[PDB]
Amino acid sequence: TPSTLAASSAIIHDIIRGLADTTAARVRTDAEATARASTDFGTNATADDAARPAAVFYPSCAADIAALLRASSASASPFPVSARGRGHSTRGQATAPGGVVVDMASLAVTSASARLAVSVDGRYIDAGGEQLWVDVLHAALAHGLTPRSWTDYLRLTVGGTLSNAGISGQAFRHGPQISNVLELDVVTGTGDMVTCSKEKDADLFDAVLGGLGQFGIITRARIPLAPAPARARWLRLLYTGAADLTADQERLIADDERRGGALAGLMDYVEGSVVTDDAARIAALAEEAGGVLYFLEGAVYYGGASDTTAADVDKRVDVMLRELRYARGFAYVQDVSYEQFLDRVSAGERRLRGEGLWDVPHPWLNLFLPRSRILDFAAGVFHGVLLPGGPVLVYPMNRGKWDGATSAVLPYDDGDGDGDEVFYTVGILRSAVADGDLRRMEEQNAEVARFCEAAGIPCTQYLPSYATQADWAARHFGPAGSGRWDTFLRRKRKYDPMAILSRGQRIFSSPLLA
Numbered sequence: 001t002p003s004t005l006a007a008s009s010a011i012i013h014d015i016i017r018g019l020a021d022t023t024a025a026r027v028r029t030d031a032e033a034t035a036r037a038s039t040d041f042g043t044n045a046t047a048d049d050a051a052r053p054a055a056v057f058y059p060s061c062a063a064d065i066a067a068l069l070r071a072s073s074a075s076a077s078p079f080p081v082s083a084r085g086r087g088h089s090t091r092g093q094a095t096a097p098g099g100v101v102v103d104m105a106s107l108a109v110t111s112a113s114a115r116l117a118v119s120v121d122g123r124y125i126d127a128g129g130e131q132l133w134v135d136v137l138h139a140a141l142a143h144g145l146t147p148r149s150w151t152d153y154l155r156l157t158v159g160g161t162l163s164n165a166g167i168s169g170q171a172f173r174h175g176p177q178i179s180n181v182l183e184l185d186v187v188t189g190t191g192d193m194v195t196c197s198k199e200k201d202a203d204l205f206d207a208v209l210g211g212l213g214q215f216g217i218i219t220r221a222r223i224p225l226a227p228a229p230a231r232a233r234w235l236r237l238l239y240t241g242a243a244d245l246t247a248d249q250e251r252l253i254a255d256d257e258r259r260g261g262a263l264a265g266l267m268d269y270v271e272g273s274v275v276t277d278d279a280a281r282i283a284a285l286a287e288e289a290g291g292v293l294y295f296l297e298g299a300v301y302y303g304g305a306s307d308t309t310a311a312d313v314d315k316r317v318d319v320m321l322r323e324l325r326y327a328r329g330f331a332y333v334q335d336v337s338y339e340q341f342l343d344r345v346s347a348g349e350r351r352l353r354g355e356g357l358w359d360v361p362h363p364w365l366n367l368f369l370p371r372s373r374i375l376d377f378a379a380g381v382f383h384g385v386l387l388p389g390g391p392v393l394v395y396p397m398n399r400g401k402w403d404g405a406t407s408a409v410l411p412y413d414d415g416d417g418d419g420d421e422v423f424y425t426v427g428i429l430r431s432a433v434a435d436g437d438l439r440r441m442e443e444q445n446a447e448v449a450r451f452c453e454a455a456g457i458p459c460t461q462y463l464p465s466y467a468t469q470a471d472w473a474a475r476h477f478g479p480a481g482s483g484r485w486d487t488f489l490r491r492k493r494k495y496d497p498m499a500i501l502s503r504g505q506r507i508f509s510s511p512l513l514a
């Protein structure tokens, strides 16, 4: 009987004003709050008028979020509700156009002891979903402990990265952040608060991990901790080609116990990058190579509560500088604290902000591709599409460190069994600075995607963005397993049947049919 027409701001405001009256949660409907909640890292505009929510909700308790989700799901025309972490998304993933954005930071009333509780005996930290990874790090280090898996950039929320995967140079060893969670407190789209883990409501736990915010809002994540090292020996090695870079990265990320190899188990972190556009020396070698150079980045942790000593580090660096195929005379080694290494990108952000180059559009593209096609991709993209800004990252990870039961999508089919253990990530992290940059960079991104589809390179987007369910099903979830899309829909029907959660992800726009 009720109309399917989208609930108006009038109906939404009446429901949420009721919530502001019956809970300690606060509501803002003013243009300043809604303009901020309409944008993300993808744009630098004051407001994205199309993405503007009807209101911003400032929860005091996870129960306020539960009341909001229940109120929307049970109403005549359910309204969109989206959690916002730091809005580091670039394609509107945290927007709730004509709906309600949940300011997750409000739960911390962002660093707060109550939201970052360390259990020394249990070797875990109970972190609020809104908490930043930098604050999780400092809270753990105060007890000589550390999370095992990171993102390169630490000013991201626990709930935000866990809804994607959370990748960095440690993922080859300990898996992404989603592989390093003991339990979660989740507020489902239906408005229930469920504590879940591999032992209880595993279906919700696995759905939420890499789940693009489709099943519920993470209000707490219990993160396991390892003994913390004190320092890190940090290497940056130049390479003249993709072949030796990738071959060496694979040697470094090899599983020491199972596969082995001379360079296995030496590095605690392995990344790489492409430079398309001591400065005069690098520029001279660039012309000789053909305009494109590569970097291998590594780190060996030592000291503190680690088993690796400063003497062990010298021995490992000696092995790596002898065995690696980097360009001789282009090896850069630095010694930093463990915290300085993990928080390294902060110096980059500070520098960019100071030059007015941070608050600019970010037409980013992140991909996962099989090891078998990395050289074909390098030839067509790094030596083609992207041939002359921002960094271009390239590095391998180990599939075995990822749990296939979660929502996360890798470039493998579940039914193909144990194929290639190694896959690559490519991060095209450019900033639109000059006039015409945005249109040019967005077209180059679309061109990378069209080039892969045409060359038959299986390509999976990390932080995916598709407009149709046909693309989500056949291009994204489908090549990952015959039951992946059916599993995603089954979980959606169970946890968010009205499809109100994170509609900015563009998977669902309307309640699921019978």
Ligand SMILES: *Cc1cc2c(cc1C)nc1c(=O)[nH]c(=O)nc-1n2C[C@H](O)[C@H](O)[C@H](O)COP(=O)(O)OP(=O)(O)OC[C@H]1O[C@@H](n2cnc3c(N)ncnc32)[C@H](O)[C@@H]1O
Pocket: 041, 082, 083, 084, 085, 086, 087, 088, 089, 090, 093, 094, 095, 104, 129, 130, 150, 151, 152, 153, 156, 157, 158, 159, 160, 161, 163, 164, 165, 166, 167, 168, 212, 213, 216, 217, 218, 219, 463, 502, 505
């Ligand atoms: C901006 C940026 C992003 C980034 C990065 C560096 C920068 C400068 N480096 C990364 C890295 O090294 N490794 C990696 O895995 N990701 C990296 N990113 C991307 C980043 O992970 C994503 O942008 C991610 O979304 C985390 O950002 P944030 O915490 O800001 O989250 P969001 O953009 O607001 O929301 C993302 C989606 O998740 C939903 N959401 C938000 N909070 C929750 C909670 N608590 N529970 C459930 N869902 C939640 C949003 O609705 C949205 O769909």
